[PDB]
């Protein structure tokens, strides 16, 4: 019941899985992208927002620089679920240009 991504609890290990999951894969699935939501959404309850802003901005530069535009939407999809559960906790959100 902890914020882990594909079995990765450490931030360095998380960002590493995303970087590759965004490079080795151009056509992500709803299930795969969902795994990211449960991870970020957990940071809110675990109070690990510190890594949140790090993972968000990290995956952003990737989903943005990615050749597939579909990645741009994936980012919003995760935020639509995370930013929601995060607001109900603190009320604030992340600043994404």
């Amino acid at each position: 019941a902890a914020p882990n991504l594909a079995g990765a609890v450490e931030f360095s290990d998380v960002k590493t899985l995303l970087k590759e999951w965004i490079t080795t894969i151009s056509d992500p699935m709803e299930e795969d992208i969902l795994q990211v939501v449960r991870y970020c959404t957990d940071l809110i309850e675990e109070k690990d927002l510190e890594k949140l802003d790090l993972v968000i901005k990290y995956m952003k530069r990737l989903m943005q620089q990615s050749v597939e535009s579909v990645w741009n939407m994936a980012f919003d999809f995760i935020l639509d679920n995370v930013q929601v559960v995060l607001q109900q906790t603190y009320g604030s959100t992340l600043k994404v240009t």
Binding site: L5, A6, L17, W21, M29, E31, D32, Q35
Partner: peptide
């Protein structure tokens, strides 16, 4: 099916 599933199972498996 999901990349995170086949990847997470890879480390867990041996």
């Amino acid at each position: 099916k999901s990349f995170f599933d086949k990847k997470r199972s890879e480390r867990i498996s041996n």
